[PDB]
Enzyme design. Structure first.
Site, PDB file in Angstrom:
ATOM      1  CD  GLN A  23      -3.102  -0.944   2.175  1.00  0.00           C
ATOM      2  OE1 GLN A  23      -4.213  -1.450   2.037  1.00  0.00           O
ATOM      3  NE2 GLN A  23      -2.743  -0.299   3.279  1.00  0.00           N
ATOM      4  CD  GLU A  78      -4.902 -10.740   2.188  1.00  0.00           C
ATOM      5  OE1 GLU A  78      -3.909 -10.009   2.379  1.00  0.00           O
ATOM      6  OE2 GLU A  78      -6.057 -10.415   2.526  1.00  0.00           O
ATOM      7  CB  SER A 112       4.928  -3.633   8.275  1.00  0.00           C
ATOM      8  OG  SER A 112       4.497  -4.961   8.022  1.00  0.00           O
ATOM      9  N   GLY A 124       3.957  -7.081  10.555  1.00  0.00           N
ATOM     10  CA  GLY A 124       3.284  -8.090   9.764  1.00  0.00           C
ATOM     11  C   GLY A 124       4.103  -9.361   9.655  1.00  0.00           C
ATOM     12  CD  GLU A 158       2.049  -4.939  14.645  1.00  0.00           C
ATOM     13  OE1 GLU A 158       0.895  -4.610  14.984  1.00  0.00           O
ATOM     14  OE2 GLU A 158       2.737  -4.277  13.843  1.00  0.00           O
ATOM     15  CG  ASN A 196       2.379   3.100  11.236  1.00  0.00           C
ATOM     16  OD1 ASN A 196       2.667   3.799  10.261  1.00  0.00           O
ATOM     17  ND2 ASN A 196       1.917   1.857  11.119  1.00  0.00           N
ATOM     18  CG  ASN A 198       0.046   4.090   3.317  1.00  0.00           C
ATOM     19  OD1 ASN A 198       0.804   3.944   4.277  1.00  0.00           O
ATOM     20  ND2 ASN A 198      -0.857   3.179   2.974  1.00  0.00           N
ATOM     21  CG  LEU A 246      20.522   2.469  -4.492  1.00  0.00           C
ATOM     22  CD1 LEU A 246      20.091   1.028  -4.742  1.00  0.00           C
ATOM     23  CD2 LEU A 246      19.448   3.232  -3.730  1.00  0.00           C
ATOM     24  CD  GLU A 269      26.621  10.585  -3.479  1.00  0.00           C
ATOM     25  OE1 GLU A 269      26.395  10.098  -4.609  1.00  0.00           O
ATOM     26  OE2 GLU A 269      26.840  11.802  -3.296  1.00  0.00           O
TER      27      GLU A 269
END
Ligand SMILES: Nc1nc2c(ncn2[C@@H]2O[C@H](COP(=O)(O)OP(=O)(O)OP(=O)(O)O)[C@@H](O)[C@H]2O)c(=O)[nH]1
Ligand SMILES: Nc1ncnc2c1ncn2[C@@H]1O[C@H](COP(=O)(O)OP(=O)(O)CP(=O)(O)O)[C@@H](O)[C@H]1O
Ligand SMILES: Nc1nc2c(ncn2[C@@H]2O[C@H](COP(=O)(O)OP(=O)(O)O)[C@@H](O)[C@H]2O)c(=O)[nH]1
Ligand SMILES: [Ca+2]
Ligand SMILES: [Ca+2]
Ligand SMILES: [Ca+2]
Ligand SMILES: [Mg+2]
Ligand SMILES: [Mg+2]
Ligand SMILES: [Mg+2]
Lengths: 438, 54, 425, 345
Positions: free
Chosen positions: A15, A71, A140, A143, A183, A206, A228, A252, A254
């Site tokens: 997402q 999923e 995440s 998850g 978590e 979050n 998001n 990348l 750097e």
């Protein structure tokens, strides 16, 4: 021109990926159908935006991205959404049943049965790159897929692409928008087995994003869509140097060279300003000094913590909009005399500055207001260890009773992996204390 | 308060300001982890089915 | 396509199951003939979780009706939504179980179980991705209790990695049919401790007290008790039947609610519960106070007698979601001594816009509290009062059971109580 | 119904605050490890600030300022005053001090010796004191040798050879001032202070017997033989002290001493405000401070040290602790003639 392949693992990664590519397309003038009128080299080109978009003979600009979820519910939103035409079906991978917020289930049980498929698809994008830089992995901590399958994917990527850089955008768990009590287990398990495979990881708490949306955007109960779009603005500021002409953080490698002097301490703190509400009828535009000053306020950090009581190892200032170097240095001078900025002795006390003249793009109908200038500060503070301490504490409370452990053992993981991954975090906390405290 | 490495282009510029100077598991080993975990899952399931058959 | 297979066994199990399908069919716009006549796409969003789709756009529940006598199931087939159930999914015998766990589990039930499993297999073979099973039954009788737990054991043998979920009506001397209900209940709990991932404990005593003291029903009936269980079953399965990733998965709910495999027995709750002052609007604070009040819970266990391991709360209707969080945090922060402090953030809240029939908003409560030990304490006391004199055992030894099997079941249930007690401290 | 936890059982001060909070019937005490609290009475050492302000729905408060140790550590205070332009190295109200590390381990050994030799040559009084177990001597050789025999950092500062002496008695003393800083960073000075007096005559010809030079209540009540003679417990309160200054010196405690004290409190706390303020922070801080002062014969006030976890005079616990609840706690968690003096910013 060297390409960057983005991988989005799990619901949060997918997402958030959707939000970023929506933004990238608006920033680069790419329509939802993949067309780009401003691109005069049809079918090809080695422009700066080509690091994230490949081109077909028909002039479609296709993201260099792979979406993976155990999923299909979330990735089916991409298959039939606004940007359904951007990706071809090979880029969207979905399983039948998810990891049930269980690290071991995503890493061992389900991961073992889909790991080779994901690599084959990633191999397909790699074969379209004349000089691949590396990967950007969104996921995440909490998850079961974001934690469990990402850590496995990172291990294999280090096997199949040894000389490539791997950066992370990781979502740190926050109870206000979480319904999984385990978590803390997944966060520590995945940080343990991913630590040696990540060159630079940007954690987004979050809790921080949630409060910025309530405080600055006046959203009473922010949704994932609100969170998001804000996260994609920060991600855009961080990846802009790879997609636009420039001389700072151009590849990348750097990011490690500029932000990570020590390999394990590779978690820079991100701070963004300004965040203005579009529903605000009247807004006074902030200056270079005011938005630069805001970069040292806890209220706009991606992780709540007090850098005044840590030490800085590096510091990058990424401006977008009407900004000239003169005003930046003037604001920096004034901030040094007023702020608590302590660098480690084995590091220079300075700032690498980047300015892109194009001001931040805002999605039509979004929550953010169009501002004339914004800045994202990337600093490697020892203060970010507060986030590890909080997380490790919750781990200790549950593990002292072996609460929920049977779910992980039942998936084939050995209980010893818990303590093994926990002692690694204890060392990570000690390394931060050795570098920062006196 | 010094500025160094000023790079300018059409889309922006970058520079540096210095305020003060200073003072893996192989492919094989991964297969073993996964297959080891899978075996332990098969063992736990066999004990269940053994218990049920009794 | 995360399908669930529903099984309802015995008198109690089939009468409560019948009402459950009646309640949720209404929420999804399915009429008694299986035709969808709703006005919202949210109703069909997750409709295949509990329904199969047949020709002519008909929706058939994925339910298997089991009983050892025809009586109760004939009533279902003649009831309101009787025509909705698949004709082939009625599996029944003629002998009966005589409120005898041994008959349902070993003798009469054994003769019928294979044909039930033939229907279960047929329903699972058409599931794109089977989540697991849910069983409605009582523990005090013979079929639901004895054969119900036999089915679980055989389903677990054939689907060892699927989630097993039950709604179990616990017997109470105050709403009793026979004196042997403690025997049948203690034997079943022995099975449930080992073979289910989640069991909603529904005490017939609590359901009675609620109908009498709160709903003000002078003379409650089984039908009146089943109205509460229907409403409760509809609430606890809201997460599964509508779009939302709070406790949307049967396996995710288990991961978040069960810290130890044996402690998977839940106290359900529901608010509001109003007597016919029935049109009054209920404010979010009111919903939260009632939902946590013991008088609104159905295990006949005072939560204040123990501590909460985990709690799941579901709110239905259009309400201030900000106000919901405020009130959920006010309850925890005002009674934090009733939540274990070694499971951080053990209270999870989910919201659903579609409220139940005839309600602007409601809240369903799912608690994994150590106070549930008092429920097993009662059953254990009643059990031992008879078993010390071997009273009424001949009904069971006559079916081939030995006294040893009773002693083992008693020990395991007493161990379960001792485990609730150690985590309460 | 507000909630709080206690993590320093040895705090006489907040043990009373904890006793008063429960007396209002609107506060409930939780186990010291329960995170669902509004107020933390935390430990003195290694207070986990990093776990505060992360509980949704709880406004959390703590009774210590993270970073205040820079003011309440002997070595830190010396470094803070010298390196902070707000205080400068020319700070007039703080004795000349140097940070000295034992040789078995920056360090100011040479810088100290330079000032020492300057005094030795200029016929001036060259008596210093060492502390971190205290040693007073006029020879630099003894002070440095005493530090090397230890293993922790020490601080050597000038010893006020001309201390103001009360009469009768001809005895030294120090002043203790309790200062409370609330979450908004208002600086409140308790109207009541104490004098810890020496029950022995001051003798500048013998720094070996440290009982007439060290005014600590513990040293006076154990090694001094005239304990509790002139005042009960070697503690004189402002009322008596002010009456003395009027009779003997024809002046008031406010004019001669208190103005300087308030200026010193302000300067120290306003200096470190950018570093410790919890104004825009996810949690809030307040703290009680104990400032220790010396007074020379010229009625000039000197700063000795700042205590981060101070105790209080037995006669002043009731008033002060109540004032801590009124201005520091109830100002954040309201309930259903102030005793402080506002010197804030
Ligand atoms: N910022 C942000 N966080 C999200 C989003 N979606 C999920 N999360 C967070 O992710 C955590 C849960 O992990 P998920 O990513 O949803 O789970 P998963 O990776 O799909 O793995 P599974 O267990 O198999 O479903 C929670 O802490 C959520 O708050 C999102 O869109 N944005
Ligand atoms: N520069 C100086 N000149 C003269 N006397 C001094 C001095 N520094 C300290 N003292 C004496 O030492 C005593 C204070 O000691 P100090 O406070 O440093 O130790 P301490 O911190 O263990 C006691 P407390 O913290 O309770 O005040 C005072 O009574 C004072 O008379
Ligand atoms: N709540 C409720 N409980 C019931 C109902 N019917 C029976 N019971 C209870 O179930 C137990 C009897 O079991 P029963 O289901 O009739 O036996 P079975 O048909 O052999 O499974 C007793 O404890 C009854 O109180 C009902 O319709 N509702
Ligand atoms: Ca091109
Ligand atoms: Ca590597
Ligand atoms: Ca027969
Ligand atoms: Mg998922
Ligand atoms: Mg019956
Ligand atoms: Mg001291």
């Amino acid at each position: 021109m060297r390409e960057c392949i983005s991988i989005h693992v799990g619901q949060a990664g997918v997402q958030i990926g959707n939000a970023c590519w929506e933004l990238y397309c608006l920033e680069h003038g790419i329509q939802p159908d993949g067309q780009m009128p401003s691109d005069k080299t049809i079918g090809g080109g080695d422009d700066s935006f080509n690091t994230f978009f490949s081109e077909t003979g028909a002039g479609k600009h296709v993201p260099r991205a792979v979406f993976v979820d155990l999923e299909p519910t979330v990735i089916d939103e991409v298959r039939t959404g606004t940007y359904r035409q951007l990706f071809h079906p090979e880029q969207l991978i979905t399983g039948k049943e998810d990891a049930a917020n269980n690290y071991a289930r995503g890493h061992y049980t389900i991961g073992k049965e889909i790991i080779d498929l994901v690599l084959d698809r990633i191999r397909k994008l790699a074969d379209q790159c004349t000089g691949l830089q590396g990967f950007l992995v969104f996921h995440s901590f909490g998850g079961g897929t974001g934690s469990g399958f990402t850590s496995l994917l990172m291990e294999r990527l280090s096997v199949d692409y040894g000389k490539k850089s791997k950066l992370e955008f990781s979502i740190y768990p926050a109870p206000q928008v979480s319904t999984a009590v385990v978590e803390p287990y997944n966060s520590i398990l995945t940080t343990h087995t991913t630590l040696e495979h990540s060159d630079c990881a940007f954690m987004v708490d979050n809790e921080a994003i949630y409060d910025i949306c309530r405080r600055n955007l006046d959203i009473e109960r922010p949704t994932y869509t609100n969170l998001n779009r804000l996260i994609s603005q920060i991600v855009s500021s961080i990846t802009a140097s790879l997609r636009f002409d420039g001389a700072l953080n151009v590849d990348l490698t750097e990011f490690q060279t500029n932000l990570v002097p020590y390999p394990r301490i590779h978690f820079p703190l991100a701070t963004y300003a300004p965040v203005i509400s579009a529903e605000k009828a009247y807004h006074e535009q902030l200056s270079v000094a005011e938005i630069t000053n805001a970069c040292f306020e806890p209220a706009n950090q991606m992780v709540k913590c007090d850098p005044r009581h840590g030490k800085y190892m590096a510091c990058c200032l990424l401006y977008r909009g009407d900004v000239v170097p003169k005003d930046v240095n003037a604001a920096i001078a004034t901030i040094k005399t007023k702020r608590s900025i302590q660098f480690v002795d084995w590091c220079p006390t300075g700032f690498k500055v980047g300015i892109n003249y194009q001001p931040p793009t805002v999605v039509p109908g979004g929550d953010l207001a169009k501002v004339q200038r914004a800045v994202c500060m990337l600093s490697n503070t020892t203060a970010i260890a507060e986030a590890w301490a909080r997380l490790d504490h919750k781990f200790d409370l549950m593990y002292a009773k072996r609460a929920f452990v049977h779910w992980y053992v039942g998936e084939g993981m050995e209980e010893g992996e818990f303590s093994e991954a926990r002692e690694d975090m204890a060392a990570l906390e000690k390394d931060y204390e050795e570098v920062g405290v006196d | 308060m010094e500025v160094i490495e000023l790079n300018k282009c059409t889309s922006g510029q970058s520079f540096e300001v210095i305020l003060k100077p200073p003072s893996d598991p192989s492919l094989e080993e991964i297969q073993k982890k996964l297959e080891a975990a899978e075996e332990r899952r098969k063992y736990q399931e066999a004990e269940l089915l053994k218990h049920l058959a009794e | 396509m995360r399908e669930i297979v529903h099984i309802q066994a015995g008198q109690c199990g089939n009468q409560i199951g019948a009402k459950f399908w009646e309640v949720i069919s209404d929420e999804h716009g399915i009429d008694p003939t299986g035709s969808y006549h709703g006005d919202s796409d949210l109703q069909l969003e997750r409709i295949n979780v509990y329904y199969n789709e047949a020709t002519g756009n008909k929706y058939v529940p994925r339910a298997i009706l089991v009983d050892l006598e025809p009586g109760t199931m004939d009533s279902v087939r003649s009831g309101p939504f009787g025509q909705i159930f698949r004709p082939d999914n009625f599996v029944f015998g003629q002998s009966g179980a005589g409120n005898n766990w041994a008959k349902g589990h070993y003798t009469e039930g054994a003769e019928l179980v294979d044909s039930v499993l033939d229907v279960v297999r047929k329903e699972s073979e058409s599931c794109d991705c089977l989540q697991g099973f849910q069983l409605t039954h009582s523990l005090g009788g013979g079929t639901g209790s004895g054969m119900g737990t036999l089915l679980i054991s055989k389903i677990r043998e054939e689907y060892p990695d699927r989630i097993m979920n039950t709604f179990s009506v616990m017997p109470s001397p105050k709403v009793s049919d026979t004196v042997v209900e403690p025997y049948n209940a203690t034997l079943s709990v022995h099975q449930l401790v080992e073979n289910t991932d989640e069991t909603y404990c529904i005490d017939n005593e609590a359901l009675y007290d609620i109908c009498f003291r709160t709903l003000k029903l002078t003379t409650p009936t089984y039908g009146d008790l089943n109205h509460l269980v229907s409403a409760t079953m509809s609430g606890v399965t809201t997460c599964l039947r509508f779009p939302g990733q709070l406790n949307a998965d049967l396996r995710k709910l288990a991961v978040n609610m069960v810290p130890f495999p044996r402690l998977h027995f839940f106290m359900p709750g529901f608010a509001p519960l109003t007597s016919r002052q029935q049109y009054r609007a209920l404010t979010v604070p009111e919903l939260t106070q009632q939902m946590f009040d013991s008088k609104n819970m159905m295990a006949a266990c005072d939560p204040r007698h123990g501590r909460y391991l985990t709690v799941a709360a579901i709110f239905r209707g259009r309400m201030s979601m900000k106000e919901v969080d405020e009130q959920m945090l006010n309850v925890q922060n005002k009674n934090s001594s009733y939540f274990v402090e070694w499971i951080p953030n053990n209270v999870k809240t989910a919201v659903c816009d579609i409220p139940p029939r005839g309600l602007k908003m409601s809240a369903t409560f799912i608690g994994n509290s150590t106070a549930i030990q008092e429920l097993f304490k009662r059953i254990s006391e009643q059990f031992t009062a008879m078993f010390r004199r071997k009273a009424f055992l001949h009904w069971y030894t006559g079916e081939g059971m030995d006294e040893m099997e009773f002693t083992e079941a008693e020990s395991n249930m007493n161990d379960l109580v001792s485990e609730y007690q150690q985590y309460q401290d | 119904m507000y909630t709080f936890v206690v993590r320093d059982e040895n705090s006489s001060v907040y043990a009373e605050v904890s006793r008063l909070l429960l007396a209002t019937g609107q506060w409930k005490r939780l186990r010291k490890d329960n995170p669902r609290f509004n107020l933390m009475l935390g430990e003195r050492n290694r207070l986990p600030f990093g776990r505060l302000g992360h509980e949704p729905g709880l406004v959390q408060l703590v009774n210590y300022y993270r970073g205040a140790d820079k003011l309440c550590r002997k070595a830190s205070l010396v470094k803070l005053i010298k390196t902070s332009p707000e205080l400068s190295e020319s700070c007039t109200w703080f004795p000349e001090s140097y940070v000295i590390y034992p040789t078995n381990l920056t360090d100011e050994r040479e810088v100290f010796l330079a000032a020492y030799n300057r005094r030795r040559e200029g016929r001036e009084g060259n008596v210093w004191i060492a502390k971190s177990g205290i040693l007073i001597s006029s020879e630099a050789s003894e002070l440095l040798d005493f530090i090397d025999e230890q293993g922790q950092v020490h601080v050597i500062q000038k010893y006020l050879e001309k201390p103001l002496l009360l009469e009768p008695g001809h005895r030294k003393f120090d002043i203790r001032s309790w200062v409370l800083v609330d979450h908004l960073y208002n600086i409140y000075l308790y109207r009541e202070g104490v004098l810890r007096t020496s029950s022995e005559p001051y003798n500048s010809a013998n720094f070996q017997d440290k009982t007439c030079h060290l005014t600590n209540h513990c040293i006076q009540k154990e090694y001094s033989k005239n304990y509790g003679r002139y005042e009960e417990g070697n503690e004189m309160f402002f009322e008596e002290f002010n009456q003395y200054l009027m009779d003997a010196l024809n002046t008031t405690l406010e004019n001669s001493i208190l103005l300087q004290i308030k200026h010193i409190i302000r300067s120290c706390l306003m200096c470190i405000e950018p570093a410790i303020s919890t104004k825009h922070l996810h949690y809030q801080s307040f703290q009680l401070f104990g400032f220790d002062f010396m007074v020379d014969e010229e009625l000039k006030v000197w700063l000795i040290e700042v205590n981060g976890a101070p105790a209080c005079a037995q006669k002043l616990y009731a008033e002060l602790c109540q004032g801590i609840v009124d201005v520091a706690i109830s100002s954040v968690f309201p309930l259903a003639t102030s005793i402080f003096i506002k010197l804030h910013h």
